[PDB]
DNA sequence: CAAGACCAATCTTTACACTCTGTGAGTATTAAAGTTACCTATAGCGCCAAGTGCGCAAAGGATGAGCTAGTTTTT
């Protein structure tokens, strides 16, 4: 039961301290060199404990002259066992004379009673120092203490990548050292006589055979461990994943009646295993762990209160981490190594305990994958996933592909708590401006959401002294508080703003909240997708959709086209002809040359009619953008959608015109108009393909994309710069 | 906190006893050996002229790095690194 | 196969930590049926002996078995475990132990193994090489029963066949001097077109003086491509001149031996003439 | 370290596939600087020789390098590659080649390596060991330049020091007969309380007849714990009786040799007395 | 004058006690089989009793013969 491990100036460590160990400690990270160095440090310390000749470790820097390894052992249970008046034995008295004798004879009669016998925890500290001349020194100059500590807190290391299934040495080592039997009372002669009596035709034949064999094979006598192993083997009835399972089960079972607490390290438990196999392994370990637990009403024979040993895992599989988090819960922790700016291993704790039972039950592989990331982007809606995960868009920016995007709500963000592991896993939370400010039409005043109030309270810092450069934050907070009323004026019947633009306020709040890892977009995703500079591309995409997806419903195209041309007017009745001729179909048949020409002429006439109507009904060319981004489930300027406007009963003419456009001409676009339909991916792919065809150079196409889409490109560039700043540290 | 016996020592006139040639020798490996201005002044001397001062009250000792300047503590640490290494090596053998 | 087992030993790359051949020899050469040992009785006996509270060792073993469930023991593994628990302990020494165990355990069974040994003298002092053969001969002669030598511990049973592959004259000298009529020497050589032959080299000598004065020079003739027999020491001095042989890099491959009529009769070079050519020079 | 390199060779466990010691020995012993070999010139030469269209081989090479990018060649690796591209190809044979290369590539340099060899005769026919020693001696004598032996290819440079660890009298006999004044024999033994000694055994003989007629019996005395010297064949017959030696398992560890006064003077057993005890029996 | 720095081995190795069979808060708290373990070493000279001694040191014959003892270092 180790509590603290400290390493100073060794290998890749400057000053690293590990504490607050649990039963199911798990180690993850990108810097495998740090894990290897930690394992080497532990093995070196335990080899020097047992007086073995090994090579001393190297120094991180040569401007020092010492390297220290410090270990702290929680010697509380052993003290309670030994100091009791009931236990009178050789081993107990020897342990007291070795561990608790020196530290207790220097205390008076006041500290011993009622001050160290109620709830105190006893600690033992051992320090190992390596000098510049390859000299090794101990803080305690007594080999007996080191031997007792080694035999009371054994260390076991398991490597699964290179493991031999034909060797059972760890199993026998665990069995031999976790028994409460004295095997020296079994005399050889009586056992030989018993075996001879059991199998013999003439008395004494087996004994004579054994004597003749021994007289020829005379070698060194058996040691105690060999004798106990032979006795166990003759007693039992028989002899990668299975070996590890057996080791863990034996370790858990045999320690329930002993005061020896081993420490186990396991490397890559999931090598060459199915995910279901790893999940079953963790589940079986948890079931065996819970079988021997005696807490509260759970009592009876076979249930104990003995503490469990410490287990460390080195894994690269999200499945094992997910199972460990879901099953063990409060009895586990997650460690992250990473590096530093100049190059040095770190150790941080990642939050893995959740107070929400729904989150634990709904825990899946995406949450575990969030652990194995170097930059997380949190978004609310499902359109952000469709926009940021586009393959063509990420092809041109080989720096945002190293970040993972996750959909999280307020409760999900609170449960995850990304701020705890801020130095290990950088993150950014992207939200909309509507989450902070709410605008109304009937009452000409803004309002502040509770999230804005919480952010203001967090930014406000009482109990502080003066600091230059901090008064600006206070002034901004005061302005945000006083902008509560903010009387304004809306034109076009509560549709636009006189002069606010929602841009200066957004920039100021972004500057204020950058310290909290937040970014508030001026508009929604659909607002950024279609802007005043993207109208030609949107129109071209609509035209391509009309040209391709629209096909003749009738199996015979020529006869149907001729009949509908002779039945409906080509100019005045173009809309009914388009509605009754062309339909959306997955398969696009190839027609004759004359039929293709007629279809192309009809499509061109329809395109001309729609563009003329669009440019005639609306004049300022901004209401076109507003209608386009509002029909695709969006809000603009006033933060109002179709349902909100209908409930508010405002802008009747605009809503009626939009309804007429939807139900009269753009009937084919309607299925690709609801939320989470797939128009974002198609539009992005078409735009990227067009710009790639037009411009060959990567710089030119990137510049054109930045010009067409300012906001999303700015977000991507900022994330890429943040990743590049911390690329060296978060990379093995 | 891990020790049972404690000892404390102090250095008399730490900043006033720092030899200027020691500072020059310590900073020489990190400065290229070349003439900054023609063939009259070197780069190392030009850099070092911004940290020293000829004290009128201590003209006997020449020019020293005075307390109250911004660069004094870093120079003191760089100069005393050698002594720190020597003392640490001595103390390591004694535990 | 089960009546005439074959054993092969290679001392060049022998592992001292592996005792599998010894266990195989001990298990195969036994005259006991271990199915009558039973399991409950032995476990109960050990539990009674070792546990103060009645029922500790048995429960411990059951608890261990319940979580280490594997394939059951085979008969050979069971007998090996019984032998190991019944005994007090677990390059040259390994070979000597194997040979001694085989000879001792073949005295009460009709199983007749055949053993082959490759390079028994690798990294071995000549004294140790001689002592190996001496110990083998002593244990061979300990169990021999013939006329006057009768009593308990002496048997009339054929010994197993042993084959040696050696490059050292010391082992050959020892096996010729000690065993005598119970040994033979095989010479492989090769044919003109290329094909392995097998011939027998005479190694049994009727004269006792020749066998007693047998030394390294006599054993050196067995590894000779061409033997030149002479009588006086002047011929040895003339034909072993370094300067004379420096100019003739073809007579240095032949060995010159001082031989008398009795020595020539005992050696009998004519028997192994196709394998070791020889010339006898006289006056 | 760079002026007096040390090379250790083991023959019991040696891999013939690996040629690292040979390459290291060749690279260390040379008088050429490879830094002036222009890479571009050699690549252009190969491209011109091997291609029908100019420059395609260079394109292939740069295409390969652009995808297999790794650490650049060190000096030793490129030296080894240059040596391999100029040569026509890459147990006992390996050792003989290494010794010959060491002797040949040191006659024009001031670097004198120190060589240690363990068990040169493991798994080796006695004739093969004798031939190995003879070949080494001939290689030594080829480059010797003493008195009238002068001319091109003969040098006055000193030879490197070589240590042998052998258990075979054949190698000792050959090295005593051939090298003579340029060899010595060391005997380790042990002390009473337990400690390793080092003594020198006399191996230089002034008498030419004794050195010419040197045989295996003379070499056998070097591996004797106790020597008994006699002056007749009757003493040999008496002291080598198998039946008499059967009852005294302490006199079987002694070697009995028939020697004359001149032979005793040449051997000089008194020089090595604390290592090999001896007794001289006369009338 | 007084002073941190006070040897190696002394045989080895291991191991819970209890009434309760899962648990223990002393004012100063190891032992017991197992296995070795081996041990060992002597002048001046001769004589008769053959090493446990006696006599004599003139032969010789039982107490006249009469006799000596290297260098250097610590010191």
Distances (CA, A) of A2 to A25, A82, A143: 13, 19, 19
Asked if the C-beta of B85 comes within 8 angstroms of chain A's C-beta atoms, the answer is: yes
Q: Which among D172, D168, D142 has a CA at the least distance from the CA of D155?
A: D142
Distances (CA, A) of B57 to A587, B23, B54, B64: 99, 21, 9, 12
Instruction: Kindly state the DSSP code that residue B61 receives in the 8-state scheme.
Output: G
Residues A427 and A404: their CA atoms lie apart, in Å, by: 10
Quote the crossing angle between the two packed helices A188-198 and C40-50, to the nearest 10°: 160
Residues A511 and A519: their CA atoms lie apart, in Å, by: 9
Tokens of C82: 């019984």
Distance of CA A209 to the CA centre of its chain: 66
Between chains, do A139 and B95 touch, taking CB under 8 Å as contact?
A: yes
Q: Which among A621, A612, A611 has a CA at the least distance from the CA of A532?
A: A621
**Longest Cα–Cα distance in chain B:** 61
Our CA-based measurement puts residue A9 at a distance from the nearest CA of chain B, in whole angstroms, of 14
Residues 6+ apart with CB under 8 A from B50: B71
Distances (CA, A) of C111 to C76, C158, C264, D88: 17, 10, 42, 57
A158 by Cβ neighbours in 10 Å (0-12 / 13-18 / 19+) ranks as middle
Adjacency order of strands within the sheet including A518-521: A404-407, A376-379, A427-432, A518-521
Query: Is there a contact between C115 and C162 (Cβ–Cβ < 8 Å)?
Result: yes
Total H helices, total E strands in chain C = 12, 8
Residues 6+ apart with CB under 8 A from A641: A630, A633, A634, A635
SS3 content of chain C, % helix, strand, coil (to 5): 45, 15, 40
Q: Which among B9, B12, B14 has a CA at the least distance from the CA of B76?
A: B14
Question: What chains are in contact with D, requiring at least 3 Cβ pairs below 8 Å?
Answer: C
Query: Is there a contact between D43 and D61 (Cβ–Cβ < 8 Å)?
Result: yes
Distance of CA D242 to the CA centre of its chain: 39
**Longest Cα–Cα distance in chain C:** 97
DSSP sequence for A608-658: HHHHHHHHHH--SSHHHHHHHHHHTT---SS---HHHHHHHT--HHHHHHH
Our CA-based measurement puts residue B85 at a distance from the nearest CA of chain A, in whole angstroms, of 6
Between chains, do D123 and C12 touch, taking CB under 8 Å as contact?
A: yes
Residues C131 and A262: their CA atoms lie apart, in Å, by: 51
Residues C21 and C8: their CA atoms lie apart, in Å, by: 9
A502 Rama class: left (phi>0) / alpha (psi -120 to 50) / beta: left
Tokens of A507: 């920039």
Distances (CA, A) of A725 to A341, A398, A529, B95: 10, 15, 28, 43
Query: How many CB pairs below 8 Å do chains C and D form together?
Result: 69
Distance, CA of C63 to C1' of E16, in Å: 20
Please report, in angstroms and rounded to a whole number, the separation of the first and last CA atoms in chain A.
31
Residues 6+ apart with CB under 8 A from A606: A546, A574, A578
Task: Read off φ and ψ for residue C114, nearest 5 degrees.
Answer: -125, 130
Q: Which among C122, C13, C9 has a CA at the least distance from the CA of D15?
A: C13
Q: Which among A119, D187, A235 has a CA at the least distance from the CA of C56?
A: A235
Q: How many residues does the structure list for chain A? A: 732
Q: Which residues, in sequence order, are bridge partners of residue D155?
A: D144
Q: What is the 3-state secondary structure (H, E, C) of A170-236?
A: HHHHHHHCCCCCCHHHCCHHHHHHHHHHHCCCCCCHHHHHHHHHHHHCCCCECCHHHHHHHHHHHHC
Residues 6+ apart with CB under 8 A from A326: A360, A361, A363
Residues C252 and C277: their CA atoms lie apart, in Å, by: 15
Task: Read off φ and ψ for residue A696, nearest 5 degrees.
Answer: -90, -40
Q: Which residues, in sequence order, are bridge partners of residue C255?
A: C227
Residues A561 and A543: their CA atoms lie apart, in Å, by: 20
Tokens of A699: 């710089």
H or E segment to which residue A311 belongs:
strand A310-314
Asked if the C-beta of C37 comes within 8 angstroms of chain A's C-beta atoms, the answer is: yes
A358 by Cβ neighbours in 10 Å (0-12 / 13-18 / 19+) ranks as exposed
Q: Which among A78, B91, A213 has a CA at the least distance from the CA of C80?
A: A213
Residues 6+ apart with CB under 8 A from C266: C205, C206, C207, C210
Alpha helices in C91-142 (DSSP H): 92-105, 126-142
Adjacency order of strands within the sheet including A136-138: A13-18, A2-10, A67-74, A123-130, A136-138
Query: Is there a contact between C144 and C99 (Cβ–Cβ < 8 Å)?
Result: no
Query: Is there a contact between C10 and C118 (Cβ–Cβ < 8 Å)?
Result: yes
Residues A252 and A178: their CA atoms lie apart, in Å, by: 11
Distance, CA of C82 to C1' of E31, in Å: 33
Task: Read off φ and ψ for residue A404, nearest 5 degrees.
Answer: -110, 135
C-alpha dihedral (A652, A658, A660, A661), degrees to nearest 10:
160
C-alpha dihedral (B71, B77, B80, B86), degrees to nearest 10:
-170
Task: Give long-range contacts, CB 8 A cutoff, 24+ apart: D28-33.
Answer: D28/D111, D29/D102, D29/D105, D29/D106, D29/D109, D29/D111, D30/D79, D30/D105, D31/D108, D31/D109
Task: Give long-range contacts, CB 8 A cutoff, 24+ apart: C275-278.
Answer: C275/C187, C275/C189, C275/C197, C275/C199, C275/C201, C276/C187, C276/C201, C276/C221, C276/C222, C276/C224, C276/C225, C276/C226, C276/C227, C277/C225, C277/C226, C277/C227, C278/C226, C278/C227, C278/C228, C278/C229
Q: Which parts of B are annotated binding residues?
A: 10
Residues C147 and A75: their CA atoms lie apart, in Å, by: 77
Quote the crossing angle between the two packed helices A275-291 and A318-327, to the nearest 10°: 30
Query: Is there a contact between A534 and A708 (Cβ–Cβ < 8 Å)?
Result: yes
Strand E, nucleotides covered by protein (CB < 7 Å) = 13-31, 33-36
Tokens of A250: 């034996």
Task: Read off φ and ψ for residue A165, nearest 5 degrees.
Answer: -75, -15
- Count CA atoms closer than 13 A to D92's CA, side-chain side: 15
Residues 6+ apart with CB under 8 A from B28: B44
Q: Which residue of C has its CA nearest to A252?
A: C67
Angle (nearest 5°) at CA A105 between A100 and A110: 105
Question: What chains are in contact with B, requiring at least 3 Cβ pairs below 8 Å?
Answer: A
Q: Which residue of A has its CA nearest to B88?
A: A65
Query: Is there a contact between A41 and A11 (Cβ–Cβ < 8 Å)?
Result: yes
Q: Which residues, in sequence order, are bridge partners of residue C201?
A: C185
Asked if the C-beta of C177 comes within 8 angstroms of chain D's C-beta atoms, the answer is: yes
Pairing, β A67-74 against β A2-10: antiparallel
Instruction: Kindly state the DSSP code that residue A96 receives in the 8-state scheme.
Output: I
Residues A13 and A7: their CA atoms lie apart, in Å, by: 7
Asked if the C-beta of D157 comes within 8 angstroms of chain C's C-beta atoms, the answer is: no
Alpha helices in chain D (DSSP H): 20-28, 39-50, 56-65, 75-86, 92-104, 126-142, 169-178, 208-212, 216-220, 233-239, 242-246, 261-267
Residues A103 and A79: their CA atoms lie apart, in Å, by: 12
Between chains, do B81 and A64 touch, taking CB under 8 Å as contact?
A: no
Between chains, do C169 and D215 touch, taking CB under 8 Å as contact?
A: no
Q: Which among D174, D193, D175, D196 has a CA at the least distance from the CA of D184?
A: D175
Q: Do chains D and B touch (3 or more CB pairs under 8 A)?
A: no
Q: Which among C168, C160, C166, C171 has a CA at the least distance from the CA of C135?
A: C171
Quote the crossing angle between the two packed helices A535-549 and A622-631, to the nearest 10°: 50
CB nearest to A235's CB, from C61, C69, C83: C61
C278 by Cβ neighbours in 10 Å (0-12 / 13-18 / 19+) ranks as buried
Distance, CA of D274 to C1' of E52, in Å: 37
Residues A350 and D121: their CA atoms lie apart, in Å, by: 64
Pairing, β A67-74 against β A123-130: antiparallel
Query: Is there a contact between A676 and A383 (Cβ–Cβ < 8 Å)?
Result: yes
Of residues 63 to 102 in chain A, which lie within 7 A of strand E by their beta carbon?
76-77, 79-94, 96-97, 101
- With tokens 């250790």, the residue in question is D8
Question: What chains are in contact with A, requiring at least 3 Cβ pairs below 8 Å?
Answer: B, C
Tokens of A556: 């015979």
Render the burial of A131-154: b for 16+ CB within 10 Å, e for the rest. Answer: bbeeeebbeeeeeebbebbbebbb
Q: How many residues does the structure list for chain B? A: 95
Q: Is the dihedral of CA C14, C20, C22, C25 positive or negative?
A: negative
Query: Is there a contact between A274 and A285 (Cβ–Cβ < 8 Å)?
Result: no
Residues C132 and C164: their CA atoms lie apart, in Å, by: 13
For an interface test with D, give the residue of C10, C124, C167, C214 to mutate (most D CBs within 10 A): C167
Instruction: Kindly state the DSSP code that residue B62 receives in the 8-state scheme.
Output: -
- With tokens 């532990």, the residue in question is A42
Tokens of A585: 């179909």
Tokens of A615: 């440019």
Q: Which among D172, D145, D149, D170 has a CA at the least distance from the CA of D159?
A: D145
What count of other Cβ atoms lies within 10 Å of the Cβ of residue A49? 21
Asked if the C-beta of A65 comes within 8 angstroms of chain B's C-beta atoms, the answer is: yes
Strands (DSSP E) found in A344-425: 348-350, 376-379, 404-407
Query: Is there a contact between A545 and A677 (Cβ–Cβ < 8 Å)?
Result: no
Of residues 239 to 258 in chain A, which lie within 7 A of strand E by their beta carbon?
256-258
- D216 contacts in C (CB within 8 Å)? 169, 216-217, 220
Residues A116 and A229: their CA atoms lie apart, in Å, by: 42
Query: Is there a contact between C237 and D213 (Cβ–Cβ < 8 Å)?
Result: yes
Residues D281 and D234: their CA atoms lie apart, in Å, by: 13
Between chains, do B81 and A129 touch, taking CB under 8 Å as contact?
A: no
C118: helix, strand or coil: strand
Q: Closest nt to A105 (CA→C1')? A: E28
Pairing, β D278-280 against β D255-258: unpaired
Residues A705 and A694: their CA atoms lie apart, in Å, by: 12
Q: Do chains C and B touch (3 or more CB pairs under 8 A)?
A: no
Q: Closest nt to A117 (CA→C1')? A: E25
- With tokens 């490059």, the residue in question is C167
Query: Is there a contact between B89 and A65 (Cβ–Cβ < 8 Å)?
Result: yes
Residues D44 and A535: their CA atoms lie apart, in Å, by: 57
């Amino acid at each position: 039961t180790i509590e603290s491990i400290r390493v100073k100036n060794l290998l890749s460590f400057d000053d690293v301290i590990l504490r607050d160990f649990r039963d199911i400690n798990c180690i993850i990270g990108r810097n495998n060199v740090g894990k290897s160095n930690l394992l080497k440090v532990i093995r070196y310390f335990y080899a020097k404990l047992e007086n073995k000749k090994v090579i001393p470790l190297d120094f991180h820097t040569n401007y020092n002259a010492v390297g220290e390894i410090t270990f702290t052992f929680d010697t509380t249970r052993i003290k309670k066992i030994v100091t009791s008046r009931k236990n009178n034995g050789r081993f107990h008295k020897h342990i007291y004379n070795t561990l608790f004798k020196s530290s207790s004879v220097k205390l008076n009669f006041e500290e011993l009673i009622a001050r160290k016998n109620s709830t105190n925890k006893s600690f033992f500290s051992l320090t190992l120092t390596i000098c510049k001349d390859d000299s090794v020194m101990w803080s305690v100059d007594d080999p007996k203490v080191r031997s007792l500590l080694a035999t009371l807190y054994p260390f076991l290391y398991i490597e699964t990548r290179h493991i031999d299934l034909y060797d059972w040495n760890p199993i026998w080592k665990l069995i031999s050292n976790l028994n409460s039997f004295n095997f020296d009372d079994v005399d050889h002669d009586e056992l030989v006589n018993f075996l001879d009596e059991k199998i013999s035709s003439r008395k004494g034949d087996y004994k004579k055979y054994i004597d003749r064999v021994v007289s020829v094979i005379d070698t060194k006598p058996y040691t105690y461990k060999e004798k106990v192993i032979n006795y166990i083997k003759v007693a039992i009835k028989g002899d990668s994943n299975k070996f590890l399972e057996t080791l863990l089960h034996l370790l858990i079972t045999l320690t329930r009646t002993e005061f020896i607490s081993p420490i186990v390290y396991i490397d890559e438990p999931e090598v060459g295993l199915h995910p279901k196999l790893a999940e079953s392994f963790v589940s079986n370990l948890n079931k065996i762990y819970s079988k021997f637990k005696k807490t509260s009403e759970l009592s009876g024979p076979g249930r104990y209160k003995t503490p469990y040993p410490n287990i460390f895992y080195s894994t690269h599989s999200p499945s094992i981490l997910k199972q460990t988090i879901k099953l063990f819960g409060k009895d586990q922790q997650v460690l992250h190594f990473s590096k530093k700016k100049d190059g040095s291993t770190r150790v941080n704790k990642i939050n893995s305990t959740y107070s929400d039972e729904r989150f634990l039950n709904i825990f899946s592989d995406n949450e575990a994958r969030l652990f194995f990331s170097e930059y997380i982007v949190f978004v609310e809606g499902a359109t952000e996933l469709e926009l940021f995960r586009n393959l063509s868009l990420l092809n041109l920016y080989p720096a945002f592909s190293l970040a993972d995007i996750y959909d999280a709500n307020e409760v999900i963000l609170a449960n995850i708590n990304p701020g705890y592991s801020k130095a290990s896993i950088p993150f950014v939370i992207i939200k909309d401006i509507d989450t902070l400010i709410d605008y109304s039409i009937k009452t000409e005043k803004f309002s502040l959401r509770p999230l804005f109030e919480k952010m203001i309270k967090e930014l406000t810092k009482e109990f502080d002294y003066y600091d230059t450069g901090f008064g600006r934050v206070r002034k901004e907070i005061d302005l945000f508080s006083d902008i509560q009323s903010s009387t304004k004026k809306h034109m076009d019947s509560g549709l636009f703003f006189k002069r606010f633009s929602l841009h200066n306020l957004s920039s100021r709040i972004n500057k204020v909240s950058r310290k909290l890892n937040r970014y508030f977009m001026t508009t929604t995703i659909e607002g950024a997708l279609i802007n005043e500079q993207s109208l030609p591309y949107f129109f071209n995409w609509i035209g391509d959709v009309i040209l391709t997806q629209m096909t003749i419903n009738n199996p015979n195209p020529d006869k149907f086209i001729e009949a509908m041309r002779r039945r409906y007017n080509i100019k005045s009745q173009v809309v009914p002809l388009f509605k009754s001729v062309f339909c959306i179909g997955l398969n696009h048949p190839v027609y004759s040359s004359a039929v293709d020409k007629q279809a192309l002429r009809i499509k061109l006439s329809f395109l001309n009619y729609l563009k003329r109507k669009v440019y005639s009904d609306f004049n300022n060319e901004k209401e076109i953008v507003l209608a386009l981004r509002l029909a695709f489930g969006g809000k603009t300027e006033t933060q109002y959608t179709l349902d909100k406007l209908r409930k508010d009963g405002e802008a009747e003419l605009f809503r009626e015109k939009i309804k007429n456009y939807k139900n009269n001409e753009l009937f084919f676009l309607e299925p690709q108009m609801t939320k989470t339909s797939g128009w974002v991916t198609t539009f992005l792919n078409y735009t990227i393909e067009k710009i790639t065809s037009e411009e060959s150079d990567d710089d030119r196409i990137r510049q054109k994309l930045s010009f067409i889409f300012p906001e999303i490109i700015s977000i991507i560039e900022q994330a890429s710069s943040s990743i590049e700043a911390e690329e060296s540290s978060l990379t093995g | 906190i891990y020790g049972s016996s404690y000892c404390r020592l102090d250095i008399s006139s730490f900043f006033n006893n720092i030899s200027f040639d020691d500072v020059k020798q310590s900073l020489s490996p990190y400065i290229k050996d070349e003439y900054l201005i023609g063939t009259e002044q070197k780069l190392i001397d030009a850099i070092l002229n911004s940290v020293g001062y000829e004290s009128p009250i201590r003209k006997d000792k020449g020019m020293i790095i005075p307390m109250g300047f911004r660069t004094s503590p870093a120079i003191s640490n760089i100069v005393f690194r050698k002594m720190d290494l020597l003392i640490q090596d001595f103390c390591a053998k004694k535990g």
